[PDB]
User: Fold RNA-binding protein FUS from Homo sapiens.
Amino acid sequence: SYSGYSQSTDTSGYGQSSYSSYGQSQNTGYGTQSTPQGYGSTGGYGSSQSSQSSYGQQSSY
Amino acid sequence: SYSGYSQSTDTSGYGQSSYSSYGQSQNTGYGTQSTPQGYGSTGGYGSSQSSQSSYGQQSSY
Amino acid sequence: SYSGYSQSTDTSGYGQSSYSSYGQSQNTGYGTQSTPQGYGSTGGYGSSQSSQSSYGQQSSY
Amino acid sequence: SYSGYSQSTDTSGYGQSSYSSYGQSQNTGYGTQSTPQGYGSTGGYGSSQSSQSSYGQQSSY
Amino acid sequence: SYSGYSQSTDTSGYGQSSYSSYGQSQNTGYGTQSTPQGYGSTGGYGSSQSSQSSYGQQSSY
Amino acid sequence: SYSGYSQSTDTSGYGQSSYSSYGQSQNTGYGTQSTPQGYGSTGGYGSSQSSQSSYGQQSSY
Amino acid sequence: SYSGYSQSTDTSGYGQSSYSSYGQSQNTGYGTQSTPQGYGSTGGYGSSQSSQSSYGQQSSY
Amino acid sequence: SYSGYSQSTDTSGYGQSSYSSYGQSQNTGYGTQSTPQGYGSTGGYGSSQSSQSSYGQQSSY
Amino acid sequence: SYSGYSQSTDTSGYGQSSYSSYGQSQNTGYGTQSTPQGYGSTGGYGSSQSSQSSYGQQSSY
Assistant:
């Protein structure tokens, strides 16, 4: 809570990734994937009191 | 809560990613994926008290 | 909580990965994978009191 | 909690991996794999009191 | 809790691995594997009191 | 808890492995393997009081 | 707990192995193997009081 | 607990092995093997009081 | 507990073995073998009070 530097929180979506490809190459993201549901990536330091759920996630067929 | 630097929170959508491709190359994002539902990426540090849910997410067919 | 440096938390989505490929090469992300559901990647240091669940995750067929 | 450096926590998604491939080569991510469900990668140092579960994860058929 | 350096915790997803391949070579990630469920990779030093379970993980058929 | 250096804990996913291959060579990850379930890789030094289980893990058929 | 150096704990996934192969060679990971279930690789020095179990692990058929 | 150097504990996954192969050669990991279940590789010096079991491990058929 | 140097404990997975092969040669890991179950490789010096068992380990058919 006190003195925070380089604070970066990310559940999905290339949190911290660069130079995926260079020159001739096929750059394709994740593709098929289901991210959280409800409190995806709990950020905002201080207090996180919640409740959620998910049952039926599908990506690409 | 006190002294915050480089504070960046992102659940999905390339949180911190650059130089995905260079020159000849096919740059394709994630493609098929379902992000949170309700409190996606809890930011705004201070307090996060909520409740949600989701059951029936589909991406591309 | 006091004095924080290089603080980076990421459950999925290439937390900290660079130079995946260079020049001629096929850069393909994860592909088929299901990330958390509810409190995916618990960040925001301070307190995390929640409850969730998920039973029915599918990626690519 | 006091004096933190090089603090990086990641359950999946190449936590800390670079130079996966160079020049002619096929760069393919994990492929088929199911990440946590509920409290995937418990970060945000301070306190983590939760409960979750998951029974029915599938990746690629 | 006091004085922390080079603190990096990762359950799966190449925790700390670089130079997987160089030049002509086939770079393939794990492939088929199921990561934790519930409290995957317990990070955020301070206290981790939770409970979870999972019975039905499948990767690639 | 006091004075910590080179602290890196990883259950699976090449904890600390580099230079897997060089030049002409087939770089293939683990392949078929099931990681923990519940409290995979107990990190965050301080206290870890939990309970979990898993019976039905399969990787590649 | 006091004065810690070169502290690295890893149950599976090449804890500390480099230069697996060089030049012409087939680099293949473990292949078929099931890692712990519940408290895989008990890290986070301080206290580890838990209970778990697993009966039904399979890797590759 | 006091003054710790070169502290590295690993149950499986090449704890401390390098230069597995050089030049023309077939580098194959363990292959078929089942790692612990429950408290695989008890690390985090300080105290480890738990209980677990496993009866039904199979690797490759 | 006091003054520890070159402390490395590993039950399986080439604890401390290097230069397995050089140049033309077939580098094959253990192959078929079942590692502990429950408290595999009791590390974390300080105290280890647990109980476990396993009856039904198979590697490769």
Remarks:
- The CA atoms of residues 3 and 45 of chain H lie 12 Å apart.
- Chain H touches chain F through ten residues (CB under 8 Å).
- Chain H has no helices and five strands.
- The longest strand of chain H covers residues 25-28.
